[PDB]
Design an enzyme around this catalytic site. Structure first.
Site, PDB file in Angstrom:
ATOM      1  CG  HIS A  40      -2.198  -0.945   0.136  1.00 50.37           C
ATOM      2  ND1 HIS A  40      -2.418  -2.200   0.123  1.00 50.37           N
ATOM      3  CD2 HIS A  40      -3.318  -0.574  -0.287  1.00 50.37           C
ATOM      4  CE1 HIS A  40      -3.176  -2.599  -0.326  1.00 50.37           C
ATOM      5  NE2 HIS A  40      -3.885  -1.819  -0.674  1.00 50.37           N
ATOM      6  CD  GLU A  71      -0.085  -3.974   2.326  1.00 49.25           C
ATOM      7  OE1 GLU A  71      -1.071  -4.194   1.483  1.00 49.25           O
ATOM      8  OE2 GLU A  71       0.063  -2.778   2.271  1.00 49.25           O
ATOM      9  N   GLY A 145       2.959   5.657  10.796  1.00 56.50           N
ATOM     10  CA  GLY A 145       4.580   6.198  10.890  1.00 56.50           C
ATOM     11  C   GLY A 145       5.454   4.820  11.111  1.00 56.50           C
ATOM     12  CB  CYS A 147       3.398   1.362   7.223  1.00 58.18           C
ATOM     13  SG  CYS A 147       1.663   0.764   7.905  1.00 58.18           S
TER      14      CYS A 147
HETATM   15  C1  LIG Z   1       1.169   2.423   7.915  1.00 57.02           C
HETATM   16  C2  LIG Z   1       0.918   3.373   7.086  1.00 57.02           C
HETATM   17  C3  LIG Z   1       0.443   4.766   7.194  1.00 57.02           C
HETATM   18  O1  LIG Z   1       0.773   5.190   8.156  1.00 57.02           O
HETATM   19  O2  LIG Z   1      -0.346   5.434   6.065  1.00 57.02           O
HETATM   20  C4  LIG Z   1       0.174   5.921   4.868  1.00 57.02           C
HETATM   21  C5  LIG Z   1      -1.029   6.102   3.836  1.00 57.02           C
HETATM   22  C6  LIG Z   1      -0.373   2.071   9.064  1.00 57.02           C
HETATM   23  C7  LIG Z   1      -0.186   1.789  10.231  1.00 57.02           C
HETATM   24  C8  LIG Z   1      -1.395   1.499  11.050  1.00 57.02           C
HETATM   25  C9  LIG Z   1      -2.071   2.975  11.088  1.00 57.02           C
HETATM   26  C10 LIG Z   1      -2.782   3.107  12.580  1.00 57.02           C
HETATM   27  N1  LIG Z   1      -1.815   1.957  13.246  1.00 57.02           N
HETATM   28  C11 LIG Z   1      -1.191   1.065  12.448  1.00 57.02           C
HETATM   29  O3  LIG Z   1      -0.499   0.549  12.987  1.00 57.02           O
HETATM   30  N2  LIG Z   1      -1.141   1.258   7.966  1.00 57.02           N
HETATM   31  C12 LIG Z   1      -2.191   1.639   7.620  1.00 57.02           C
HETATM   32  O4  LIG Z   1      -2.760   2.785   7.675  1.00 57.02           O
HETATM   33  C13 LIG Z   1      -3.225   0.398   6.760  1.00 57.02           C
HETATM   34  C14 LIG Z   1      -3.023   1.116   5.363  1.00 57.02           C
HETATM   35  C15 LIG Z   1      -1.507   1.227   4.837  1.00 57.02           C
HETATM   36  C16 LIG Z   1      -0.642   0.062   4.935  1.00 57.02           C
HETATM   37  C17 LIG Z   1       0.473   0.025   4.446  1.00 57.02           C
HETATM   38  C18 LIG Z   1       0.901   1.261   3.526  1.00 57.02           C
HETATM   39  C19 LIG Z   1      -0.008   2.388   3.402  1.00 57.02           C
HETATM   40  C20 LIG Z   1      -1.288   2.258   3.955  1.00 57.02           C
HETATM   41  N3  LIG Z   1      -4.557   0.706   7.097  1.00 57.02           N
HETATM   42  C21 LIG Z   1      -4.834   0.448   8.645  1.00 57.02           C
HETATM   43  O5  LIG Z   1      -3.979   0.122   9.298  1.00 57.02           O
HETATM   44  C22 LIG Z   1      -6.346   0.781   9.203  1.00 57.02           C
HETATM   45  C23 LIG Z   1      -6.419   2.242   9.803  1.00 57.02           C
HETATM   46  C24 LIG Z   1      -6.224   3.302   9.124  1.00 57.02           C
HETATM   47  C25 LIG Z   1      -6.233   4.174  10.270  1.00 57.02           C
HETATM   48  O6  LIG Z   1      -7.087   4.510  11.042  1.00 57.02           O
HETATM   49  O7  LIG Z   1      -5.126   5.275  10.329  1.00 57.02           O
HETATM   50  C26 LIG Z   1      -5.052   6.663  10.937  1.00 57.02           C
HETATM   51  C27 LIG Z   1      -3.751   7.033  11.220  1.00 57.02           C
HETATM   52  C28 LIG Z   1      -5.597   7.686   9.595  1.00 57.02           C
HETATM   53  C29 LIG Z   1      -6.003   6.611  12.231  1.00 57.02           C
HETATM   54  N4  LIG Z   1      -6.590  -0.253  10.072  1.00 57.02           N
HETATM   55  C30 LIG Z   1      -6.979  -1.508   9.766  1.00 57.02           C
HETATM   56  O8  LIG Z   1      -7.508  -1.713   8.490  1.00 57.02           O
HETATM   57  O9  LIG Z   1      -7.413  -2.372  10.640  1.00 57.02           O
HETATM   58  C31 LIG Z   1      -8.118  -3.663  10.544  1.00 57.02           C
HETATM   59  C32 LIG Z   1      -9.761  -3.376  10.778  1.00 57.02           C
HETATM   60  C33 LIG Z   1     -10.760  -4.512  10.271  1.00 57.02           C
HETATM   61  C34 LIG Z   1     -11.964  -4.165  10.537  1.00 57.02           C
HETATM   62  C35 LIG Z   1     -12.282  -2.943  11.270  1.00 57.02           C
HETATM   63  C36 LIG Z   1     -11.640  -1.957  11.252  1.00 57.02           C
HETATM   64  C37 LIG Z   1     -10.054  -2.199  11.027  1.00 57.02           C
END
Ligand SMILES: *[C@@H](CC(=O)OCC)[C@H](C[C@@H]1CCNC1=O)NC(=O)[C@H](Cc1ccccc1)NC(=O)[C@H](CCC(=O)OC(C)(C)C)NC(=O)OCc1ccccc1
Ligand SMILES: *[C@@H](CC(=O)OCC)[C@H](C[C@@H]1CCNC1=O)NC(=O)[C@H](Cc1ccccc1)NC(=O)[C@H](CCC(=O)OC(C)(C)C)NC(=O)OCc1ccccc1
Lengths: 188, 188
Positions: A40, A71, A145, A147
């Site tokens: 992602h 992923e 931050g 990932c």
């Molecule tokens: C790392 C990438 C990042 O920071 O975003 C750049 C676009 C994230 C680490 C997560 C975020 C919150 N805590 C963590 O550990 N990963 C993500 O944001 C991923 C998507 C992704 C992955 C890799 C690269 C880029 C993007 N998405 C999620 O983890 C998602 C929650 C997103 C979120 O709420 O972020 C904030 C910071 C805006 C609040 N979580 C998720 O899908 O969990 C599973 C789930 C299942 C059912 C219902 C709800 C959640």
């Protein structure tokens, strides 16, 4: 106790800061000029590595035989330095783990270590709306931050961080057979 | 190598999350119901400790004999649990240190460890416009959110994080004589 010394040796020799259109990610270099980054991150044909624009010679977004996101994207980079070959620290099989460390190397956090406790083979995860398989879970409130952060126990590099729901964190698994020198196949 | 195991034992038994009007700070408990927090946290007559409102029975903002800020505030708390007495791990004198760890315990980062490298007895610091003395410096890009973070080497708790300029971080020193059971003196 957590394997902080192993985590630090991996971070020191095998991580770089990668930056795509989606932002910064910790990046694990695996061997030669081959590294991983979460799918992602949306890797294109160039990427910044420690702020230096770098050609992405190959990028393979891994999917399993159900055609589901794993992923993990494996990239080959046009750089001079080779990574220390750490394929021998990759697990052969899916597994559960004890007392793991999550390590981050970004501009904001150039080396930080978080003990995440027990890691379980979790399986299916709906990751930001994308069905994803082969996920590891830890009960720790991981954050944006982190990932690409590397998940280790002593002697094993087991995954990279990809997601979290506010209470738990999720890593995509790394398996040894992802990186074995292999075949002849049109893949794009 | 950095003393990660010592840092973790201190974090496990001797830190809480403190929250004042200024936000959250890692808080080191030193002995009995006595803890420290950076002076710029602006402690009042109550504080949240691990989200539980708690009376601050005493707060002493330390200053040296030049009447200059030391940035350490020692608080006495109305809580049931006593802290493990860690006064014997406090240094007697000002000093420079090798290979230190900065550890944070906040809601956002419930336990995270950052090796900051060499720590030097820095002295004077203009801290957000406040002249401050007895400062320790490390070459690490510390961030908002890390104030109160505990700085250790093996066997020594040497300071708490109070500041940074984007390239370096700064801790207020902790000295053993700050906490010795002492005298009879009107202090407010
Ligand atoms: C790392 C990438 C990042 O920071 O975003 C750049 C676009 C994230 C680490 C997560 C975020 C919150 N805590 C963590 O550990 N990963 C993500 O944001 C991923 C998507 C992704 C992955 C890799 C690269 C880029 C993007 N998405 C999620 O983890 C998602 C929650 C997103 C979120 O709420 O972020 C904030 C910071 C805006 C609040 N979580 C998720 O899908 O969990 C599973 C789930 C299942 C059912 C219902 C709800 C959640
Ligand atoms: C911890 C407290 C906090 O996050 O703020 C709550 C109000 C801060 C850690 C610093 C911030 C940046 N990186 C760090 O390591 N500490 C401070 O912000 C302190 C003031 C303080 C201390 C304790 C409790 C509450 C407040 N101030 C500084 O460190 C100051 C820079 C402030 C800053 O730029 O923060 C951002 C996040 C808004 C960007 N730095 C400083 O004074 O350095 C010395 C200096 C000398 C000469 C010229 C310039 C700087």
């Amino acid at each position: 106790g957590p394997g902080f010394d192993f985590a630090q040796a991996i971070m020191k020799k095998n991580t770089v800061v990668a930056r795509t259109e989606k932002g910064e990610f910790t990046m694990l270099g695996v061997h030669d000029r081959v590294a991983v980054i979460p799918t992602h991150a949306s890797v294109g044909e160039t990427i910044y590595i420690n702020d230096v624009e770098t050609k992405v010679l190959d990028a393979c977004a891994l999917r399993d035989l159900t055609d589901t996101n794993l992923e993990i994207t494996i990239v080959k980079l046009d750089r001079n330095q080779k990574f220390r070959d750490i394929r021998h620290f990759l697990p052969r099989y899916e597994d559960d783990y004890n007392d793991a460390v999550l390590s981050v190397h970004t501009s904001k956090f150039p080396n930080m270590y978080i003990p995440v406790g027990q890691v379980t083979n979790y399986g299916f995860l709906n990751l930001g709306g994308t069905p994803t398989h082969r996920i590891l879970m830890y009960n720790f409130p991981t954050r944006a931050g982190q990932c690409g952060g590397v998940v280790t126990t002593t002697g094993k590099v087991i995954g990279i961080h990809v997601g979290g729901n506010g209470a738990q964190g999720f890593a995509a698994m790394l398996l040894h057979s992802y990186f074995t020198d292999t075949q002849k196949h049109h893949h794009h």
